[PDB]
Amino acid sequence: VKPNYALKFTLAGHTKAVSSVKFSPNGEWLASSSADKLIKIWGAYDGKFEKTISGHKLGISDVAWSSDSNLLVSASDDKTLKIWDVSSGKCLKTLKGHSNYVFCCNFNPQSNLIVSGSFDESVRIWDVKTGKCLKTLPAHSDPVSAVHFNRDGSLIVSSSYDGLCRIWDTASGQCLKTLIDDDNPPVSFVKFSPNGKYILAATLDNTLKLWDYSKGKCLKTYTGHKNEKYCIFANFSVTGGKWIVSGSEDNLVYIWNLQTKEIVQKLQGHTDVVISTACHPTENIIASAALENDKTIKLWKSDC
C-alpha cells in the first residue's frame, strides 16, 4: 500500500511563522499557533476560519487540545501557558511557573493534567481545574523540546537538546527510565506510539527512531529527510496505512512506511521548513505548517 495525499487547502492567516498545528479529538477543528502571538481555529475539513484567540504577550511555540475538544492549552515565549475555552476564546487559566520560554505542551488522556516543557530546562505538571502547578521535574540540562503523555497517562516522555529522552512516572514524578545514545545528538522531538510500547524520537542528525524504551533498543530508523536545526513534530498515522509522518527542513512533508522504513510519499508545496505536521483522528488527513518565508497551513487528503 502507498498513500496518495493531495493538497486540498492552503490556510493563510498568520503574519509570522507558524509553530504548531493540532487536530481536535472530535475531528472538527484544527488549531494553529504562531510567532505572531496568536492562536487560530479552522475547520478541519474545509479550512474555514473559525476564530482568532489572543492574549499571549509573546510568540507561541505549541498548542494542545483537551480530550473533550473544549479546551486548548498554549505554550508561549511569555513564560506562561494558557488554558482557553475554545468556544468563547476566553483565557480560563494562566499557568505561571516557568522562568523562560514555554516550548511544548500536552493534556493527559483524562485532561485533568497538563504537561509542559521549557527553555528553563524543566518539565512541569499542572492541574487543569485549578491552574496550579502540581509538580516541577528537573528534567534536563538544556531546553525541553517535547513532552507527551502515554495513552494511560501514567508516563510522561520528555526530550531535550541535551541528548536525553526520559520516561517519568506521572503520579510520583520519578524518572522511570532514561534512554541514552552514546553519540548523544540533540533530541528535538519525542512522542509515545498509540500503544505506549514505543517512543518516536527525532534527533538533529536527520534521523527519526522508533524506540522500545523498556529494553532500550532501537526498533526502527527513518531517514531521507532533513532535520538539523528545528524541533519538528512527528506523527504516527493510523487511520489508513501505518505511516510515520514528519515535517522536514527541505520544505517537504515526509511519509514513511512504519515497518519497511521506506519513504512512501513526499508532499510538496511549502516554501519554508515544515515545522509542524498533524494527523486527523479519524480521516486520512494531514495538516502541515511552515516557518517565516511560508507562514501557511496546508491540508492534505488521501484515500488510504
Partner: peptide, 6 residues
C-alpha cells in the same frame, strides 16, 4: 521559540 534556531 520553536520558529527560531537554538
Amino acid at each position: 521559540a520553536r520558529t527560531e534556531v537554538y
